[PDB]
Amino acid sequence: LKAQALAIETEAELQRVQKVRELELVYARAQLELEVSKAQQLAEVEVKK
């Protein structure tokens, strides 16, 4: 019985952990894109000046 209950709560935990880490990965990818955009534009105006 302990095995059955641990199986249910493990599946229920792992689905939440999967969805949270997936959306966090999407948001971190977008932040990386904005980060390198700002870095290269400020580097470009520094180089040009």
Add this chain to the structure above:
Amino acid sequence: QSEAEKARKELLELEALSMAVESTGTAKAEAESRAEAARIEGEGSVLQAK
């Protein structure tokens, strides 16, 4: 005293069986009640986890 001991041997034989019954009953009851309560709690905890 020899004949009294010959009968007392048979009384001591019967008291052995009485003591065996009186001990195994208490052991079996106190074990099976806690086993049943543990079964109830386990079957509950499966549904609670669901």
